[PDB]
Amino acid sequence: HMDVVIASSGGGWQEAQDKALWAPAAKALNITYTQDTFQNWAEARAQVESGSVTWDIIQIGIADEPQAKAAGVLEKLDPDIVNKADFPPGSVTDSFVANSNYSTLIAWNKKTYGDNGPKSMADFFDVKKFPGKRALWNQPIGMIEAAALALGTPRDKVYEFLSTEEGRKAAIAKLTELAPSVSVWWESGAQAAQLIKDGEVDMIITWGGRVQGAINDGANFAYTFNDAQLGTDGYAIVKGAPHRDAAMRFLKEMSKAEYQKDLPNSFATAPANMKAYDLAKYTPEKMATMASAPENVAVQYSVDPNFWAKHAKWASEAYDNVRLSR
Ligand SMILES: O=C(O)CC[C@H](NCC(=O)[C@@H](O)[C@H](O)[C@H](O)CO)C(=O)O
Ligand SMILES: [Ca+2]
Ligand SMILES: [Ca+2]
Ligand SMILES: [Ca+2]
């Protein structure tokens, strides 16, 4: 009953955070914690709106942070909770603290296409050149943008294109056109990793760590950082969290470089605290799999939380229609 409740999205990502961050930080603070899993931020919104908040800390994506904050789902974090200078600019807000960088990328089945798989969004959406079963997320972040890239929008103009009603409509029409070839709308990263390990799909748009984990487990898949979305994951405290003050201390501790340095040990992720890189001498194999590595950054575009602050509601509704029509 004294336990701080921490919730992430499960699988290898939750295990990495638990092993590297939660278990050692709790021990150092003499605190006890309970874990939970969720896939959609609207589940935290439901707890707040019902007046029955059970979660303390929620790991969320940076583009969900503006709509969660606007809806009164997040607590305002104590002022000097982290040294913002240790983190990438914008990765720390008044209600969110980054823990990692990751990518929403293309992976393909080598049994189906060999080395000649889809290497861009245009290729992924091309059913004639690449016939086969596609897998997309059942949520729109990284999916709406993948359709904009498939339409031939340059990476640096993704959100400029999506700031227009015309651009937004064309991206939805592009997802609708691909929907007949989508065999599964995956819900969790562990389910996406399982589809890869079983070869149940020919191509998938999912998170890099999940892909790499499946490949390490023996999946006959390949992937590319080309046209991938560079994302930021982090922590927020739920408005009216039962253990608000203990959660705040837990968050301050787990954000330190001494814990962050261990996050890539069992999972292909990139720690958000820059001091972690000075503390840990990562292997070249590990470096190459990190989303925030310079060679990988060059072929990606960053997620824009300002776009999602404005059009998340329209996107969620329009994307639901693409999926429910097939
Ligand atoms: O940061 C990482 O390394 C993990 C990347 C990836 N997390 C994606 C992610 O932003 C969401 O699961 C997010 O937490 C929810 O949609 C709620 O905002 C994963 O589960 O694989
Ligand atoms: Ca997940
Ligand atoms: Ca996994
Ligand atoms: Ca941006």
UniProtKB/TrEMBL annotation:
Gene3D superfamilies: Periplasmic binding protein-like II. Keywords: Calcium, Metal-binding, Periplasm, Plasmid, Signal, Transport. Ca(2+) 2 binds at residues 209, 268. Its main location: periplasm. Ca(2+) 1 binds at residues 39, 189. GO terms for molecular function: metal ion binding; thiamine binding; thiamine pyrophosphate binding. One of its GO terms (biological process) is thiamine transport. It comes from the Bacteria. It is found in: Periplasm. One of its GO terms (cellular component) is outer membrane-bounded periplasmic space. SUPFAM superfamilies: Periplasmic binding protein-like II. InterPro entries: SBP. Belongs to the bacterial solute-binding protein 1 family. This is MotA. It comes from Agrobacterium tumefaciens. The lineage of its organism: Bacteria, Pseudomonadati, Pseudomonadota, Alphaproteobacteria, Hyphomicrobiales.
